[PDB]
Amino acid sequence: AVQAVHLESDAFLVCLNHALSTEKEEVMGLCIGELNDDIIRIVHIHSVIILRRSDKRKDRVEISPEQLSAASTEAERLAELTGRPMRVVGWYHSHPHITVWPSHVDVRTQAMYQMMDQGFVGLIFSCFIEDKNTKTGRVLYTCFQSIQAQKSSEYERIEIPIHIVPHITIGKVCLESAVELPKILCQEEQDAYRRIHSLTHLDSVTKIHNGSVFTKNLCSQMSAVSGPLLQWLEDRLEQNQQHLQELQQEKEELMEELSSLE
Amino acid sequence: MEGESTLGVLSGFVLGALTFHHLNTDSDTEGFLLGEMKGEAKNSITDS
Numbered sequence A: 001a002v003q004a005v006h007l008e009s010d011a012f013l014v015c016l017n018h019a020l021s022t023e024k025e026e027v028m029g030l031c032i033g034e035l036n037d038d039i040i041r042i043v044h045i046h047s048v049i050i051l052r053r054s055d056k057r058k059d060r061v062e063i064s065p066e067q068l069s070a071a072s073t074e075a076e077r078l079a080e081l082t083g084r085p086m087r088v089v090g091w092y093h094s095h096p097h098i099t100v101w102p103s104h105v106d107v108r109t110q111a112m113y114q115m116m117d118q119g120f121v122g123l124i125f126s127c128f129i130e131d132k133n134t135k136t137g138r139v140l141y142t143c144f145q146s147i148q149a150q151k152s153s154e155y156e157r158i159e160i161p162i163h164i165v166p167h168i169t170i171g172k173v174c175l176e177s178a179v180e181l182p183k184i185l186c187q188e189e190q191d192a193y194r195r196i197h198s199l200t201h202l203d204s205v206t207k208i209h210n211g212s213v214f215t216k217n218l219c220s221q222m223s224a225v226s227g228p229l230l231q232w233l234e235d236r237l238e239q240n241q242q243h244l245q246e247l248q249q250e251k252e253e254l255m256e257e258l259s260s261l262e
Numbered sequence B: 001m002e003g004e005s006t007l008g009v010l011s012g013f014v015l016g017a018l019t020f021h022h023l024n025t026d027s028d029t030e031g032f033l034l035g036e037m038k039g040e041a042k043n044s045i046t047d048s
């Protein structure tokens, strides 16, 4: 069983931006990385894949072996592109307006995944917690595994130490993962519309209403997700230009300091 | 299977028209209802 988890901030950012995308439902994804031994068994998570949940509902969070096949294919692709030994090592989901701790169903699912390999670890992000009494906001995250109880079945939780490795700059893999969220939302809306059109024998004014609903939904998606994401990327480009200028100034200053000194 | 319900549906205006036809009749009245009956399937999911 795993003894520690290191998460690249590069991927923690993708997880956090995925968690804050929506409060109306719980969202999920998978974590790719490597197993390592040092000083102790550790899991280094490098990148994540965002996933679409079909069944939805409260507390009913599972990933299909189809999603596992897609994720393992992406893992092999990234392992060959990056030369890293990347396998699917974990999973994460969001608990909005809900305590960060796992439910007995979360733990049973973690155990069902450990049946694949006891080296599998779970993550949970507790998002926007509202408390007008304190008038403060809060956001938490935790890592966990499961153990068979002393008594029949009834698995129990166990905590895993998790740290964030300071990845000073953005990897391209995380940008290519973050831009998949708008694509997945648009694809979800499109699949809903396509399944709506299956009963072709339907009222025309009703089809206009459903088209208007589809347009309003994608307008909301662009106003709340794609638009702010694009604004963030432009702001980051401006920040990087200013930072490049400052670092060039500092490089010239240190070059002068070492040339004139000794 | 044989999980079957039998909801009934009307429009405000049809109930209004029945009420109007009645209020004009100073006695019991009666008639026939024409429309269509359609079965819809919901494949509910239970836990997993």
Ligand SMILES: [Zn+2]
Binding pocket: A059, A061, A093, A094, A095, A102, A103, A106
């Ligand atoms: Zn959960």
